[PDB]
Amino acid sequence: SRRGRALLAVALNLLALLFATTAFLTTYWCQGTQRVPFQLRRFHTGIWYSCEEELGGPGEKCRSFIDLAPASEKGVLWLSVVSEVLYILLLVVGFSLMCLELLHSSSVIDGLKLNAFAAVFTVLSGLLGMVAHMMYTQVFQVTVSLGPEDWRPHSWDYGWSFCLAWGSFTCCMAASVTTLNSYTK
Amino acid sequence: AEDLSKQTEIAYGTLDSGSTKEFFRRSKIAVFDKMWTYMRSAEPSVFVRTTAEGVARVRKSKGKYAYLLESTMNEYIEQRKPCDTMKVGGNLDSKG
Amino acid sequence: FSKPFMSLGISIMIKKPQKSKPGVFSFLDPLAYEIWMCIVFAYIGVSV
Amino acid sequence: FSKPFMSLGISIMIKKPQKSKPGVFSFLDPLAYEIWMCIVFAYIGVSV
Amino acid sequence: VLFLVSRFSPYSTNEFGIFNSLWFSLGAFMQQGCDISPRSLSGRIVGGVWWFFTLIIISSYTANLAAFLTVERMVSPIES
Amino acid sequence: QGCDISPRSLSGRIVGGVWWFFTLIIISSYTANLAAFLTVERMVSPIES
Amino acid sequence: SKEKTSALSLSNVAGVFYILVGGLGLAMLVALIEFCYKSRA
Amino acid sequence: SKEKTSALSLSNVAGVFYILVGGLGLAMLVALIEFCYKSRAEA
């Protein structure tokens, strides 16, 4: 029994290893479109590089997302990128301690304290992780309005891998309860 | 104009070669003497080249740059596209 | 010259005040800072 | 005449707005005082 | 986080399971409350801060719905 | 008015969970719409033709 | 004549989530020291 | 001329605190009246 509940917390955090890093590498967070005078181009911007598709070619003309942001919201944005690196790191610190939940690892003796430290390493990660997306979105709401130089999207809609960004935070909380109800029963 | 005196967070300037810059140098008003020193003392480049560059700094600096000019130009820029300026305060001196 | 057909003066030009960013603590914009301190002062006293 | 040594025009003259003095019991103001008393007398009614 | 705290030295019998910790928070968010209440200090903070979250969001919901229905009450379509 | 008796079963808590959201909207719809009457009132004529 | 109505954006109530999570990190911090205070006694 | 308020001030909700401070002062008095009634029975 205790092998299966411990395997479930590792398998969910392995998805949180996948979903949060799939969101972090992709640049498809906000699928916007921009007309020029009627000719609309479709684009997508992530956290680092804003790449728009040119009309009928290779496309992907990539501006860095940093310098286009306004000056007050730029150092606000760095606190999102600092915390997002602090999110992926503390999930790997969380997930590698889930590998010590395996009894093929170290021991039974003081291993139960390793699992009490384990969900804490995922909960204190996900709390910093949810804010790191909340810190991103309120910056992006400004850049639709007034921030950059005269490119303003027709749509500010969240694309894919932003739903994958919440799902890793969802899987961090679903895995932390799996290692804690088996901590009691 | 006394609110541009007691507050140093918002920059304010005139045209580089005009009677308006000539006005604050020869002033003996208590507030207007403080404004002329601040155009010179605390200074990254405050003044602009001509009137159109002064209006263009107002649209760009996002409420951090005020531009002191005539009251007959401060209304027409207000009533023209892209409609991003207003007229605050009263008329300071009188001309004709 | 003739008499002045138009009066004028030196006047300040500033940006149209748009809506800014709403503040980072803009949820407590209705009740001023004299009340949120005094509620906490009255929170402690009624508890004690 | 000379040139104008001051410029002037017609301007509006109204009374200065005084202090908006609310009173110490300004919070009771939305409900009329024939409601606030009848809340208390219907409080004793349902309590009985 | 309320479930995470109540399995440590917050004890006696641990009642705040994950099927109960959702039911306290949903009772706190709809302002109905439940019979259960956190008894340790680290449970009273997570039960305390979430109360201040549901006080602002509900009051922001009622006011903004009073903002739609007042502006819609003032549309006044063209009479002359 | 928070009742002392609480549901415990899951199908008791889905019923008490959805109904609690029913009261959060309707009481906030009723409070918001009484604001819309006392702020801007529109006195309407009985006849128009 | 150009006025309109608006939904509440995220930035309007953005502070309360930060009071929320900032309340959550303080709830984890006292959970350690109360685990320390109980264990010493 | 720069005095302008756009928020709820302490003066608009002042009498609630006056009921609250007045509510505490009548509460501590009755705690003295009840405590003397208990020392009446304990004698």
UniProtKB/Swiss-Prot annotation, chain B:
Tissue specificity annotation: Detected in forebrain. Detected in dendrites of neuronal cells. Expressed in the pyramidal cell layers of CA1 and CA3 and in the granule cell layer of the dentate gyrus.
Site note Interaction with the cone snail toxin Con-ikot-ikot, residues: R25
Its job: Ionotropic glutamate receptor that functions as a ligand-gated cation channel, gated by L-glutamate and glutamatergic agonists such as alpha-amino-3-hydroxy-5-methyl-4-isoxazolepropionic acid (AMPA), quisqualic acid, and kainic acid. L-glutamate acts as an excitatory neurotransmitter at many synapses in the central nervous system and plays an important role in fast excitatory synaptic transmission.
Up-regulation conditions: Down-regulated in the pyramidal cell layer of CA1 in the hippocampus by global ischemia.
Cellular localization per UniProt: Cell membrane; Postsynaptic cell membrane; Postsynaptic density membrane
Modifications after synthesis and translation: Palmitoylated. Depalmitoylated upon L-glutamate stimulation. Ubiquitinated by RNF167, leading to its degradation.
Note: The postsynaptic actions of L-glutamate are mediated by a variety of receptors that are named according to their selective agonists. This receptor binds AMPA (quisqualate) > L-glutamate > kainate.
Residues reported in the UniProt entry to bind L-glutamate: S19, T20, E70
Subunit structure: Homotetramer or heterotetramer of pore-forming glutamate receptor subunits. Tetramers may be formed by the dimerization of dimers. May interact with MPP4. Forms a ternary complex with GRIP1 and CSPG4. Interacts with ATAD1 in an ATP-dependent manner. ATAD1-catalyzed ATP hydrolysis disrupts binding to ATAD1 and to GRIP1 and leads to AMPAR complex disassembly. Interacts with GRIP2. Interacts with GRIP1. Interacts with NSF via its C-terminus. Interacts with CACNG2, PICK1 and GRIP2. Interacts with GRIA1 and SYNDIG1. Part of a complex containing GRIA2, NSF and NAPA and/or NAPB.
Domain of life: Eukaryota
Residue numbers carrying Phosphoserine: S27, S61
Family stated for the protein in its record: Belongs to the glutamate-gated ion channel (TC 1.A.10.1) family. GRIA2 subfamily.
Name of the protein: Glutamate receptor 2
Domain remark text: The M4 transmembrane segment mediates tetramerization and is required for cell surface expression.
Curated annotation (Swiss-Prot), chain E:
Residues of the full protein shown: 560 to 656 of 883
Assembly, per entry: Homotetramer or heterotetramer of pore-forming glutamate receptor subunits. Tetramers may be formed by the dimerization of dimers. May interact with MPP4. Forms a ternary complex with GRIP1 and CSPG4. Interacts with ATAD1 in an ATP-dependent manner. ATAD1-catalyzed ATP hydrolysis disrupts binding to ATAD1 and to GRIP1 and leads to AMPAR complex disassembly. Interacts with GRIP2. Interacts with GRIP1. Interacts with NSF via its C-terminus. Interacts with CACNG2, PICK1 and GRIP2. Interacts with GRIA1 and SYNDIG1. Part of a complex containing GRIA2, NSF and NAPA and/or NAPB.
Expression by tissue: Detected in forebrain. Detected in dendrites of neuronal cells. Expressed in the pyramidal cell layers of CA1 and CA3 and in the granule cell layer of the dentate gyrus.
Intramembrane region positions: 16-31, 32-34
Transmembrane spans: 41-61
UniProt remark on domains: The M4 transmembrane segment mediates tetramerization and is required for cell surface expression.
Annotated coiled-coil segments of the chain: none
Residues annotated as site: Crucial to convey clamshell closure to channel opening: I78
Inducers of expression: Down-regulated in the pyramidal cell layer of CA1 in the hippocampus by global ischemia.
Cited function: Ionotropic glutamate receptor that functions as a ligand-gated cation channel, gated by L-glutamate and glutamatergic agonists such as alpha-amino-3-hydroxy-5-methyl-4-isoxazolepropionic acid (AMPA), quisqualic acid, and kainic acid. L-glutamate acts as an excitatory neurotransmitter at many synapses in the central nervous system and plays an important role in fast excitatory synaptic transmission.
Record family assignment: Belongs to the glutamate-gated ion channel (TC 1.A.10.1) family. GRIA2 subfamily.
Cytoplasmic domain ranges by topology: 35-40
Protein name: Glutamate receptor 2
Record's comment on post-translational modification: Palmitoylated. Depalmitoylated upon L-glutamate stimulation. Cys-34 palmitoylation leads to Golgi retention and decreased cell surface expression. Ubiquitinated by RNF167, leading to its degradation.
